[PDB]
Design a protein around this ligand. Structure first.
Ligand code: GTP
Ligand code: ACP
Ligand code: GDP
Ligand code: TIV
Ligand code: CA
Ligand code: MG
Ligand code: MG
Lengths: 334, 427, 54, 437
């Protein structure tokens, strides 16, 4: 009879996990502040890692990797990629980015802004989306917090019919042995309104967030194209597959990112252990070149994929540590 | 650190004499007072309970008290009757007639000074007295009335010493008179204020164990006392033998009592055995742990699942894997963490002693400070109220100078104690 | 990289290696705390003996 | 030469003191009767070992140490132990009754009736010194004596010996070897009162030592003796620079200089390797690179925490045995590229290294195997604050209900001191946070 606690009520993913655990009849939920737990579904902020693994007679596991925030924050991700030899600086799959503080690498950003202007090539960026540096710096200083300036991919792959923009969300599970598992089911969070190349003011066809979009539901149910359809589209419209044209790059980027920070966050020889679910956001240009946009530390899932993914988490991340009385994951080997 | 033992009344002397009989055998002391053991573990902390005389004679640091000579004459003619210092036999002639007032205010007040002289004589011999332990019943007159009088006067002369008691609670299942709830309620009022540690030995529980579990059709007081002496030997083990912590009465109180008034403990024991009947099969550690935590093994008729454990002290006796003990005890806490309060971290401690009790290859004694103990005091309170609402049998007390108000006050304080235990059950 | 302050002897040796450069109460008051706490003890004990006196 | 006086308070302090001084004798070739054949200056001298051992005309070398416990039981075993002749009666001080796991009882009540005697017995040792550096104080956090009387002693020492340094070897409480449920109370209370009086304190979590003994010495249930012999090895590694010829950490002030840039943050993390079982039949001796790399494994630390998620302020490596600077530097260069070692911006990323060619001495019949080379790393990392976080959390759980508080109030302590102590700890956690993240 294993025990667990829940300290993030807003987690739609782990609300389903706690449900599945109880339904086995071999897992018992304790109160929030009960230290005698086997599993901790921790909070998103100020997770007390320091108090883990100090309970005699209890193997303890938490659903978060301490230090993984360096990968899952926009200012941190840029710094991580730029300073890490395994990634920096000729990184081919991450857009040119810079860290900017409100009134740092502001002078460095302008040095590159000149080449694009004194080269008469594409010079659109993103924090809002603009082609003028002055319009952007005035926006960051007016907000208050730290922002990141990034090169805007002016030539994205566009779905047909619709001439639409999209981004790919991949769910990745890293268990206690630092096995990197890619969920075989990803999702394309598509824009419904046709992509406009000239007018950047209209951020409804540039930004592909599920909330902003909610022409919603015209082409597919809820502006979400799964892999079977997207693969079929790539075969019919471009004479290729999702595996060859995109997924190899995706698996490569995921593998590379987590390998880089492994020695900093691994719980191999620690007194407590960690697993964590990541959500990688990718962007595809018209030449079928995959770009990493960012990494989310606390990702939500797609309604269709909750049942399968959440069950998947139990099998390889929880039951692997706490056994009870074909696979939906692709193991990215290293 | 010496302990001064006191036993008052019929019940107090009968379980008291049985206690000395049991531990004397454990420490290798014979009725003559001479040592005939084989292990040095027996004599290392024997000074806690025994005085040493010339020729290496060991005499219990015990004072026997009663208001009638009947029961104490039976002690002096009992098995280990001769071991006791004859000057420590302090008795009257009138008796108490199961009357708290007689024991506390009239008959006992006439004898209490004689007792305190013997307490003083014993204490002055101590290199460093740590405190006192009293054995008595709460349902009678002497052990209940005079016993609580002694406690109050001992506190007055030794306010910086620990007071411990083994208090036998009355039960209609094993009843002498109808006024036992009166005597008990009046006594609890005293114990709440003037003791640091009280082991609640419930005759209701003892009877149920003998009847339901031990399959004794008609249990006697002797059958009841087999469970008491087994329990008493257990809870005092860590005081009598060299252990990892070398426990004393004060350190026990500090670790067991989070709030001063909540110092009424539920004792437990495993395996439960009847007299004469020898068991041939030693219990495994998982069995000891499971049984000692079961309600059927509690010496206080309270359901531990109806409350939460504030603190727990446990002692395993016999040759066994202390690693296995640790795992099993940690397992109980990890399996049933809801019955342990979360605002007292690590509130369960376990010790182990190599020397097992007579007739058992291994045993486990349980000391629990549970909020479920309120069920005991509520039971007494109900029986108290049923009579007091009609002022029944009160003339036995007013005849000794008591007033009705003193009953009302005693009732209120025990009900307060109940609500105090209830307060932390929902924390 | 840079090893500095190398000091050697028969018993052993010591040195420093740099990888990268950077970027009370008085006796009075004590005796006052102890005695004041003693007064609180005396007060508690007196309240007990007064309660027992009643 | 400048002298150091060791003070051992409470059961933990005394019994650890026994382990250390036993080991000190074996390292210097001093026999139980106090005779040291190799010392050719009969009746005195000013060698490095005279820092800890004074000398009589009879050629007896006696520890500059005082043992104090409010209960006679533990020290009585020193009076009759194998090293009974080593110390003399005036060094072994005992009371009548202990502090009963109560800080207030050890600090206020019973501490008041013996504090003058102890200081007098300490003053006697100090009089035999030509240039006293300061004191090394051994005690527990959880004990009533170790917590209560220590804080009182440390206060008076700052008054009587204002110019002198004061170091601590403190035992952090662990449920696996618990003696009281209120050990978190005593820990917070003694830390608060002692903080401004301590220059550098080495915390040892019994949890870590207990598990190291189980994991690496294959001892299913470690005894105090098992724990202490391992601790004494660590303590010896730390004090070896005071007792032997060298040029690193040669005096007490240098400890604070090299390990403690910020005064309040004076708790360096100790990591030791290798710990090998004596009854391990087949053992491949570990190289300089292997033992040095082990200094960055949490499983070898005296306190379980994660230095990867903090920042370093200082770092000393103390080698004993077959070790030369070349192999150390080669080991460090490799480790640096493999592990996360972040120094604070206002500190140089570097290591102070000390080597003693004599390998670590093992107690005959002990659990530790002889090794050709060992190392103790002293790193002032903000990650050790995890221990304060654990402790302060247990404190809050009990104190929210004022559980067991009455025992302390009954000894004359004010309930306000609980909140005052906890506030100081809250500030300490903040200090670590500012420096660390
Ligand atoms: N490592 C180690 N820890 C010990 C030893 N002895 C006691 N402790 C620890 O010390 C804490 C309790 O403090 P003690 O030293 O035993 O008690 P004390 O200092 O004598 O204080 P009182 O007995 O209450 O007066 C517990 O957490 C024990 O685990 C020891 O020999 N070695
Ligand atoms: N460099 C770039 N070039 C082109 N488009 C970009 C871009 N960076 C971001 N986008 C677009 O902007 C959208 C939102 O940006 P961003 O990913 O920062 O927000 P977000 O945090 O909500 C993603 P998530 O919700 O998964 O965390 C992306 O979905 C993508 O559509
Ligand atoms: N366990 C036990 N309880 C007893 C014994 N004798 C009396 N009692 C209980 O004690 C109460 C009577 O008190 P008693 O000791 O006889 O009165 P006293 O001699 O004046 O103190 C009743 O509730 C009995 O159940 C005994 O030998 N064993
Ligand atoms: O030896 C001991 N001394 C103590 O203070 C006891 C203790 C109780 N709690 C402790 C806690 C911590 C540490 C020690 C103890 C947690 C809560 C209750 C402990 C003990 C264990 N089983 C026993 C059986 C009989 C008598 C004493 C004991
Ligand atoms: Ca000399
Ligand atoms: Mg009777
Ligand atoms: Mg002690």
């Amino acid at each position: 009879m294993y025990t667990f606690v829940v300290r993030d009520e807003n987690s739609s993913v782990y609300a389903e996990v706690s449900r599945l655990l109880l339904a086995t009849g071999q897992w018992k939920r304790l109160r929030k502040d009960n230290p005698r737990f086997n599993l901790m579904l921790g909070e998103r902020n100020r997770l007390p890692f320091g108090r883990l693994g100090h309970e005699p007679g209890l193997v303890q596991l938490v659903n978060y990797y301490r230090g993984a925030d360096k990968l899952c924050r926009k200012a941190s991700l840029v710094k991580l990629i730029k300073t890490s030899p395994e990634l920096s600086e000729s990184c081919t799959w991450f857009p040119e980015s810079y860290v900017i503080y409100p009134t740092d690498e502001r002078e460095v950003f302008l040095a590159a802004y000149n080449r694009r202007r004194e080269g008469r090539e594409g010079n659109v960026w993103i924090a809002l989306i603009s082609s003028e540096a002055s319009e952007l710096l005035d926006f960051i200083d007016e907000q208050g917090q730290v922002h990141v300036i990034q090169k805007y991919l002016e030539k994205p792959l566009l779905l047909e019919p619709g001439h639409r923009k999209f981004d790919i969300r991949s769910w990745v599970l890293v268990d206690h042995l630092y096995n990197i598992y890619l969920y075989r089911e990803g999702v394309l969070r598509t824009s419904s309104e046709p992509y406009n190349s000239a007018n950047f003011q209209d951020k409804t066809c540039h930004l592909t967030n599920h909330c902003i979009q909610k022409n919603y539901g015209r082409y597919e149910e809820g502006n979400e194209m799964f892999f079977e359809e997207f693969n079929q589209y790539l075969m019919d419209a471009l004479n290729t597959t999702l595996e060859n044209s995109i997924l190899l790059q995706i698996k490569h980027i995921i593998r590379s990112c987590l390998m880089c920070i492994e020695p900093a966050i691994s719980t191999k020889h620690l007194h407590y252990q960690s697993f964590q679910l990541f959500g990688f956001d990718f962007m595809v240009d018209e030449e079928l070149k995959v770009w990493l946009i960012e990494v989310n530390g606390a990702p939500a899932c797609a309604q269709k994929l909750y049942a399968e993914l959440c069950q998947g988490i139990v099998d390889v991340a929880i039951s692997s540590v706490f056994p009870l009385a074909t696979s939906i994951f692709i193991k990215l080997h290293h | 650190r010496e302990i001064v033992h006191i036993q008052a009344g019929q019940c107090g002397n009968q379980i008291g004499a049985k206690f000395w009989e049991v531990i004397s055998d454990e420490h290798g002391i014979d009725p003559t007072g001479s040592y005939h053991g084989d292990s040095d573990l027996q004599l290392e902390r024997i000074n806690v309970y025994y005085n040493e005389a010339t020729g290496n004679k060991y005499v219990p640091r015990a004072i026997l008290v009663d208001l009638e000579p009947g029961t104490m004459d039976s002690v002096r003619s009992g098995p280990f009757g001769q071991i006791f210092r004859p000057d420590n036999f302090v008795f009257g002639q009138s008796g108490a007639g199961n009357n708290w007032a007689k024991g506390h205010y009239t008959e006992g007040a006439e004898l209490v000074d004689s007792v305190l002289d013997v307490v003083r004589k014993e204490s002055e011999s101590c290199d460093c007295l740590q405190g006192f332990q009293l054995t008595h019943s709460l349902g009678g007159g002497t052990g209940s009335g005079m016993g609580t009088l002694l406690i109050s006067k001992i506190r007055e002369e030794y306010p910086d010493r620990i007071m411990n008691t083994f208090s036998v609670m009355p039960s209609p299942k094993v009843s002498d008179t109808v006024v036992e709830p009166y005597n008990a309620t009046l006594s609890v009022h005293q114990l709440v204020e003037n003791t640091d540690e009280t082991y609640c030995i419930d005759n209701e529980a003892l009877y149920d164990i003998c009847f339901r579990t031990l399959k004794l059709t008609t249990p006697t007081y002797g059958d009841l006392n087999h469970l008491v002496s087994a329990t008493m030997s257990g809870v005092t083990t860590c005081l009598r033998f060299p252990g990892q912590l070398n426990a004393d009465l004060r350190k026990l109180a500090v670790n067991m009592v989070p709030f001063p008034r909540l110092h009424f403990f539920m004792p437990g024991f495993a395996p439960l055995t009847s007299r004469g009947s020898q068991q041939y099969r030693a219990l495994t550690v998982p069995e000891l742990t499971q049984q000692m935590f079961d309600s059927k093994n509690m010496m206080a008729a309270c359901d531990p699942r109806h409350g939460r454990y504030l603190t727990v002290a446990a002692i395993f006796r016999g040759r066994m894997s202390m690693k296995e003990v640790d795992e099993q005890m940690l397992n109980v806490q990890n399996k049933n963490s809801s019955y342990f309060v979360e605002w007292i971290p690590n509130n369960v401690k376990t010790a182990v002693c190599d020397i097992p009790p007579r007739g058992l290859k291994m045993s486990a004694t349980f000391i629990g400070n549970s909020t479920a103990i309120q069920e005991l005091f509520k039971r007494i309170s109900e029986q108290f109220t049923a009579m007091f609402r009609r002022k029944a049998f009160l003339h036995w007390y007013t005849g000794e100078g008591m007033d009705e108000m003193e009953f009302t006050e005693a009732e209120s304080n025990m009900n307060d104690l109940v609500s105090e235990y209830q307060q932390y059950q929902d924390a | 990289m840079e090893v500095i302050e190398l000091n050697k002897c028969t018993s052993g040796q010591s040195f420093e290696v740099i990888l990268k450069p950077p970027s009370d109460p008085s006796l009075e008051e004590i005796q006052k705390k102890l005695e004041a706490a003693e007064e609180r003890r005396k007060y508690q004990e007196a309240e007990l003996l007064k309660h027992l006196a009643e | 030469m400048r002298e150091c006086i060791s003070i051992h308070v409470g059961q933990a302090g005394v019994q650890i003191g026994n382990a250390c001084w036993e080991l000190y004798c074996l390292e210097h070739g001093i026999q139980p009767d106090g005779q040291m054949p190799s010392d050719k200056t009969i009746g005195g001298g000013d060698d490095s070992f005279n820092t800890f051992f004074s000398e009589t005309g009879a050629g007896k070398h006696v520890p500059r140490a005082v043992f104090v416990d409010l209960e006679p039981t533990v020290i009585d075993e020193v009076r009759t132990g194998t090293y009974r002749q080593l110390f003399h009666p005036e060094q072994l001080i005992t009371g009548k009754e202990d502090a009963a796991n109560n800080y207030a009882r050890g600090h206020y009540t019973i501490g008041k009736e013996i504090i003058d005697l102890v200081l007098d017995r300490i003053r006697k040792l100090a009089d035999q010194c030509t240039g006293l550096q300061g004191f090394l104080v051994f005690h527990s956090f959880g004990g009533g004596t170790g917590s209560g009387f220590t804080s009182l002693l440390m206060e008076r020492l700052s008054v009587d010996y204002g110019k002198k340094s004061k170091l601590e070897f403190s035992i952090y409480p662990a449920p696996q070897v618990s003696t009281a449920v209120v050990e978190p109370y005593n820990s917070i209370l003694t830390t608060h009162t002692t903080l401004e009086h301590s220059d550098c304190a080495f915390m040892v979590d019994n949890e870590a030592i207990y598990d190291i003994c189980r994991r690496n010495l294959d001892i299913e249930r470690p005894t105090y003796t098992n724990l202490n012999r391992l601790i004494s090895q660590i303590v010896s590694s730390i004090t070896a620079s005071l007792r032997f010829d060298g040029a690193l950490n040669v005096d007490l002030t240098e400890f604070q200089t090299n390990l403690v840039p910020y005064p309040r943050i004076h708790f360096p993390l100790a990591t030791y390797a290798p710990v090998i079982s004596a009854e391990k039949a087949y053992h491949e001796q570990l190289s300089v690179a292997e033992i040095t790399n082990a200094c960055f494994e949490p499983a070898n630390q005296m306190v379980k925490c994660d230095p990867r998620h903090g920042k370093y302020m200082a770092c000393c490596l103390l080698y004993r045995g077959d070790v030369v600077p070349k192999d150390v530097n080669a080991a460090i260069a490799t480790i640096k590229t493999k592990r996360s070692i972040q120094f604070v911006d206002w500190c140089p990323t570097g290591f102070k290294v000390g080597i003693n060619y004599q390998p670590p001495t093992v107690v005959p019949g002990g659990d530790l195997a002889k090794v050709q080379r060992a190392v103790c790393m002293l790193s002032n990392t903000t990650a050790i604050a995890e221990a304060w976080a654990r402790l302060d959390h247990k404190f809050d759980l009990m104190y929210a209900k004022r559980a067991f508080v009455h025992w302390y109030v009954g000894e004359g302590m004010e309930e306000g001191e609980f909140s005052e102590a906890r506030e100081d700890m809250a500030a300490l956690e903040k200090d670590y946070e500012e420096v660390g993240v």
